[PDB]
Amino acid sequence: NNNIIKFDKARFTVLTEHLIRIEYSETGEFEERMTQMVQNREFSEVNFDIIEKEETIEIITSTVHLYYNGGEFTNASLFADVKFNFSVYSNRWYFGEKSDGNLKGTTRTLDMIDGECPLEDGIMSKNGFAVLADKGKVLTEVGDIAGNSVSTIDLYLFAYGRDYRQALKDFYQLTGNTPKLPRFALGNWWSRYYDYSDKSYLALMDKFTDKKVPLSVSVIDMDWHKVSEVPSRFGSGWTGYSWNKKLFPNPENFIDELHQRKLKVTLNDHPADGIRAFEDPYPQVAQTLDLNTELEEAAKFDFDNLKFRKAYFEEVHGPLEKEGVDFWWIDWQQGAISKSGVDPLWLLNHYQYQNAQKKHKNNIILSRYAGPGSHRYPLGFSGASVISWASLDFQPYFTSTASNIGYTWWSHDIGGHMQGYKDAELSLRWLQFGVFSPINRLHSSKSEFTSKEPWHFDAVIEQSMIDFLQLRHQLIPYLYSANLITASEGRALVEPLYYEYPMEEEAYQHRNQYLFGEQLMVAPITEKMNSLLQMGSVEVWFPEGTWYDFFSGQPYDGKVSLKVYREITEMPVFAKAGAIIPLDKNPLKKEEIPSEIIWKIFPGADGEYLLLEEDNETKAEFVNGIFTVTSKKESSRKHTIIYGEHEIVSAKRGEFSIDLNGKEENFDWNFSTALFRRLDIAEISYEQKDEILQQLSLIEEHEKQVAFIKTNENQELQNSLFELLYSGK
Amino acid sequence: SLRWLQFGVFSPINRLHSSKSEFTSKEPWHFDAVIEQSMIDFLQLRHQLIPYLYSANLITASEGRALVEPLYYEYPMEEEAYQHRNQYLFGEQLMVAPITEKMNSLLQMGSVEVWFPEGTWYDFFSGQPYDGKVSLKVYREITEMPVFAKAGAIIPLDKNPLKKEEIPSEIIWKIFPGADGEYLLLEEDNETKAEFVNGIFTVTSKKESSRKHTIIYGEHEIVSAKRGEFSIDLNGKEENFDWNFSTALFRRLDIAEISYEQKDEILQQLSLIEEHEKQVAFIKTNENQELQNSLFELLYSGK
Amino acid sequence: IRAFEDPYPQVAQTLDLNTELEEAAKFDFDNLKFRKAYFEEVHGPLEKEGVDFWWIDWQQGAISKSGVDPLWLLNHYQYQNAQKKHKNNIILSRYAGPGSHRYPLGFSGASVISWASLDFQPYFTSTASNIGYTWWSHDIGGHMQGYKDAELSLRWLQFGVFSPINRLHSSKSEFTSKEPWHFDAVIEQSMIDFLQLRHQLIPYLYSANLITASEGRALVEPLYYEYPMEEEAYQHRNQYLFGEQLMVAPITEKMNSLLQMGSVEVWFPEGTWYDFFSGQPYDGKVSLKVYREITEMPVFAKAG
Ligand SMILES: OC[C@H]1O[C@H](O[C@@H]2[C@@H](O)[C@H](O)[C@@H](CO)O[C@@H]2O)[C@H](O)[C@@H](O)[C@@H]1O
Ligand SMILES: OC[C@H]1O[C@H](O[C@@H]2[C@@H](O)[C@H](O)[C@@H](CO)O[C@@H]2O)[C@H](O)[C@@H](O)[C@@H]1O
């Protein structure tokens, strides 16, 4: 190709104006095969310039000068200057050196992590460049490990500046797009490390129904299999493939009962101890792999081995799938060691994700992160987080930052996994985040005390958790449409603020704030409430524009950074003027696609929303106060329209237009009501409540209302009253 | 010592006195060059105020009105007039809020919560404006005292406070723009009326004299050393004082014992952000609570 | 030298650069032709306009094809090149390893403005004599970040006046000027007094400079050079000899507000010592905490 240049023992491939592959080969042969990371090097032709001399070469694109002075790659022989001025002297890449600016990516797991842990670099940098080293093995055409690359150094130089979304799109072109999730993945999951019986598990599922909590997935953790019943001469019961018959005397009947309740079923698989001689599938595996059964030779875990993988999928997973298991929870914690040098977690995720496609369309796994490109094998499973405010306070940042290495379907244990401390408010705040996260999977440790059941908690916490869990199912249309946009267009559901606002310094200073799809901006509260206010808080950056609280309609004039206060039952979620958000009107109703959609419209600007579905596309347009709904294909679906406050149209069938110009634009939210509520719940002196209510009611000029609150001895009460005055300005 | 002298100068009598200690002299030159110069400035101000004080003295004797009044004499139905114990009226033209607490070393400024009655008020010294009615924490360096005059205030000052003479040969008429006003200067052997009506300033006296009048309208000396009775039209003259938000902001940030990164960010953000409500939202995020109140005073004056 | 620069056309011609692709003359001090073009065609025109010597401000790492630190190549070649236009010329540049004392002056760079930075700096300065690097120029008052305190600025200037080089410098902040009249009348007058003292000391400094060059004796010595067998000469990190006639104990801690004085523990060697400024006497040998107002610095001279 014209986009390929060889010089000395190096090869340079200009894939885009902003993406260059850099290779070294001692043998003069360069690698064309796919790798664990890279699935596609076919990119459209681009323009660039070369200065080639006897001893040096310079490649020049719109954004980078790449220099190579010959010989082995060193920090002196191979380096690049970006054509940007984001920094004063951090604009140069040197081979093998780190530079400042990397916005980070993700890491394997949150196992044993209490609050923050270090992350790996991503492809995004504030200074406009990043290098992604390909250190993986080569694949065969069908996707088996083929061995070592002939490109003994193989690098990707990203020089996208702050065009983060295009960097991610081209990353997906190189490493392959995320597959589409199935709709069931986007609902509530129930999970608990608890030794349920068939009877007590179904009783709990029927209790969820009675309690008005919708579920899409039934996880069965490791007590599904033999544990204490495993003879100690075999080792532990951690790995198992044999039903505990006391708890599950008829597995297929139990899974049929979950299927009748419209639940998808997954089992915990700890693969590391393989198939030992006590297991129900051992006789078939032993025959297939020619094991010495009289010496009880184990089929040790070996995912490098084709015969082992075949026996694992066909003779170990196969019978369980025949009993009705829908997909696999791969729960690997036993290290990165294999004869091939390929991480066993990568081999599991790559091969299990492929195998899952045989029994179901668009199937998933649930497994830990296995390095760049492992977004091809959703879903991510972050694992055994410590239950703490610190862990919750890290998790939104962790989740949005992961989009910087394209790993956009993290499923966290909602409420935290293990250890840590009880606080029903922490559980409630964690569920609020989970509902506005990629995946909402409730899960917990082997403790008698860590159940995430809403009715574990008092009546106030229970009702709020049920409300948020119902909200998750109202959001499934929005989530599923965003899912198809991840798969087809390479856009993350969860974006850091700096994707949309790359030149705003405040977009780098609100770590836990994120865009959730294209219509909603989320600022979860991740700190214990101030008991004097009976409210939690978070500093929100409002971009330019008019913003509304998604729930209350409280308005905010951007651009501003403003501390916002919410009771423990309320979450800061915001929509711009013109936002249109579809909601399922019947989130409890078991139906493959919603029979009724609520179109929730935020007044004050034009907008539009495209609802992508399995078998349809529905466009909602809001232009000069006219709201129109059209679909590719006709259906019996009934549309409800909510314009700000008021339901305008109920259950209208087919395509239509309606003029909202003559309809009430304003939400109910008002300063006086909100003020009374904040003063009333506050654990402060009644004389202070009386004086604040009286003075803020009497003083007419906004600047003097602000001067009055500025004299308050309670600094946080000042900030709370200021938020109300700012919204009421 | 310096704050106590500031109060004394705006008290009924300014008598420096001290104990038998070798260490308690009230001589200004007992102190360092900064304190000395400020004490000399305030002590000269006391003599500039003698015409105002002597006129108020004759008003105590003849009309039973105190020189120093609690706020509630003028504002009996305002609850805030009972909540500012150290704030007072000083004659009829000036309202005083002495600073009586050691400065905040992070700000290099002392402070007092001032109640501003209804009306437009000016700092007597700087011309910094304040829209009443409001209660507002005000910040001053140790060399500066919170003293305020309403729009229309007229304050006579002795132009020659060091000059040994039984009555001033020269009076400065210090006029605060924005309203009508008047001042009656009672003396041993004269009465002089200063009137400010629809922007016309008039001076008349019961008896004629050689006295020379100076007129200062806000910022600017309009008339120097003019003899006898006269009128002058100030409608076409600059009403506005120099005091400006940007200069005052730079000065407060510059003396503050805070991080230079904080100074840089506050100066940059308050210069860039155009909408007053967003300037206030920006300072509301500051981790230094007293710095918030100081920046808020400047924003309130600059609104 | 990139394609927008005023000297680029001449450099491009000298180094055979591709001007239509705007090929930069990338920094390469391993390259004889680059160095020649840098000195003759980049620095040369600026020297012709009257620039006397070069402040080499290098912060971009230690990488080169040769394995020689670019900072060493800059200091070695620039110091040599500076001798062409002026006798006994200098540079101003960071330390480039043992032997780089051949290329004065040392430039310590972007210190944080803090009491902690000032408290390190006398020790830093005297200890440098142990690898023969005796002409450190510190940013007097600190370079960047940190916190405002006019007393820190005044104490830092006191040290600077009794340091190898007295260069006032500061960051891009509107708030960090080292102008004496930035501060109140007391600080301003003290800074002016110390700045005048620096010029009173130039004969003493210049004589010590010729003694460094001809006899290998540092201007600033740790106490243990003169008193190697006295344990106390190893226990006063910020105390030093300044030439042969003066012993300096800078105050590097914020004053005690109850005393309105700063302090430092001074080790007085055997002998009769006088405060250089006041004549206050001290009988050695003794370790004694000494107190000074913020306008006064502990500097001592022996009888004789
Ligand atoms: O399948 C049970 C459980 O396994 C993993 O978590 C374990 C955790 O619960 C246990 O306390 C620790 C202590 O050794 O080991 C594992 O981390 C898995 O992460 C979890 O989701 C499962 O529920
Ligand atoms: O020439 C300007 C300046 O450069 C150097 O110091 C810089 C410093 O002021 C800046 O804040 C930081 C932040 O990136 O970079 C450099 O350290 C040099 O050391 C200094 O003397 C100069 O004044």
From TrEMBL, chain B:
Glycosyl hydrolase family 31 C-terminal domain boundaries: 65-155
Keyword annotations from UniProtKB, A to Z: Glycosidase, Hydrolase
Domain of life (superkingdom): Bacteria
A Gene Ontology BP annotation from the UniProt entry: carbohydrate metabolic process
Coiled-coil features, chain-numbered ranges: none
Molecular functions per Gene Ontology: hydrolase activity, hydrolyzing O-glycosyl compounds
Family indicated by similarity: Belongs to the glycosyl hydrolase 31 family.
Name recorded for this polypeptide: Alpha-xylosidase
Originating organism: Lactococcus lactis subsp. cremoris (strain MG1363)
Portion of the full-length sequence here: 437 to 739 of 739
